[PDB]
Design an enzyme around this catalytic site. Structure first.
Site: not given
Ligand SMILES: Cc1nc(C)c2nc(CCc3nc(N4CCCC4)nn3C)nn2c1C
Ligand SMILES: [Mg+2]
Ligand SMILES: [Zn+2]
Length: 313
Positions: A68, A72, A106-107, A269
């Site tokens: 962040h 970004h 935005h961040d 993912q």
């Molecule tokens: C652009 C982007 N933006 C956001 C907000 C985001 N968040 C994520 C995490 C997803 C995720 N990983 C996991 N785990 C990992 C191992 C155990 C569980 N659960 N989840 C839901 N990737 N990501 C991306 C690529």
């Molecule tokens: Mg944000």
């Molecule tokens: Zn953002």
């Protein structure tokens, strides 16, 4: 006046594509942003001196966190630029002006922690702003910077145009709270399908701009596989530091934030692409058909994550 920003040839051509990466040369990001405002809005939208002073104060109020950060911010603005250039005639002069600024801002002053961690830590910001805690802070930081001497890039707007642009920026920045995204996309899905969706209804524009903000915010899933994969390492570096802090307060973090579940990243993912990314770019492609390359790119990175799970990488 007669001063156009230009980019080297590869950037001049590739910046027009959704999948463009702004590259590792930090000192070129301000010029990339100015280039994008000029082509998207005009050389007359902003006084160059104020814009430059605004860009540098914005940069200075982003922190050196893994994800962040200032990179970004410019990345999320470049995606908005791509959407605006491929849907030229759908957006007002104020919206074009306001949305690239909203994306850059935005961040602002993000610390690398979720709204949840602020609420569990009991951070002052969580008392000031009970919901969308960081997002109300980001809009607050934007208004602060706008009020510094020499920084009012909107100084030439009417009293009421000014208030309309700040109101576009506020709603754009609030919409980046992913807790708000699910409901916003659901409502847009239903309005699109029953054919009630109506771009003259201001509250409908609001939702469409909100879904664009989620799309631009998530655009790391729409890049070339090597960019997508290396960005995911920055994303988890923050989430796992947050996980460590949760444990320090005596709280089991969610799996997403627990570095002990490193091995499960490919499957997390998939969940994310299926629960958030794919639905986001689908609904956006329906409402604005020329954004389809974001959905195509998102689907390709989902296949790459499937390939990782299958040992094919
Ligand atoms: C652009 C982007 N933006 C956001 C907000 C985001 N968040 C994520 C995490 C997803 C995720 N990983 C996991 N785990 C990992 C191992 C155990 C569980 N659960 N989840 C839901 N990737 N990501 C991306 C690529
Ligand atoms: Mg944000
Ligand atoms: Zn953002």
């Amino acid at each position: 006046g007669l001063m156009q920003f230009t980019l080297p040839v590869r950037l001049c051509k590739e910046i027009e594509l959704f999948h463009f990466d702004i590259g590792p040369f930090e000192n070129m990001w301000p010029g990339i942003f100015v280039y994008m405002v000029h082509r998207s809005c005009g050389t007359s939208c902003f006084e160059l001196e104020k814009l430059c002073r605004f860009i540098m104060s914005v940069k200075k109020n982003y922190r050196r966190v893994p994800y962040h950060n200032w990179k970004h911010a410019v990345t999320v603005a470049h995606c908005m630029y791509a959407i605006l250039q491929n849907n030229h005639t759908l957006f007002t002069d104020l919206e074009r002006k306001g949305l690239l600024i909203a994306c850059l801002c935005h961040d602002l002053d993000h610390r690398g922690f979720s709204n949840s961690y602020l609420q569990k830590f009991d951070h002052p910001l969580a008392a000031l702003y009970s919901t969308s805690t960081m997002e109300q802070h980001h809009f607050s930081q934007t208004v602060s910077i706008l009020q510094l001497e020499g920084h009012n890039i909107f100084s030439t707007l009417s009293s009421s145009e000014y208030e309309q642009v700040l109101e576009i920026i506020r709603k754009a920045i609030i919409a980046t709270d992913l807790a708000l995204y699910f409901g916003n996309r659901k409502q847009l899905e239903e309005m699109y399908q029953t054919g009630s969706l109506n771009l003259n209804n201001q509250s409908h524009r609001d939702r469409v701009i909100g879904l664009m903000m989620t799309a631009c915010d998530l655009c790391s899933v729409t890049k070339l596989w090597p960019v997508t994969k290396l960005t995911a390492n920055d994303i988890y570096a923050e989430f796992w530091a947050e996980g460590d802090e949760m444990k320090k307060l005596g709280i089991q973090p969610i799996p997403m934030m627990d570095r002990d579940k490193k091995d499960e990243v490919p499957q997390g993912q998939l969940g994310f692409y299926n629960a958030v990314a794919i639905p986001c770019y689908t609904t956006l492609t329906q409402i604005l058909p020329p954004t389809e390359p974001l959905l195509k790119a998102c689907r390709d990175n989902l296949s790459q994550w499937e390939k990782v799970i299958r040992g094919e990488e």
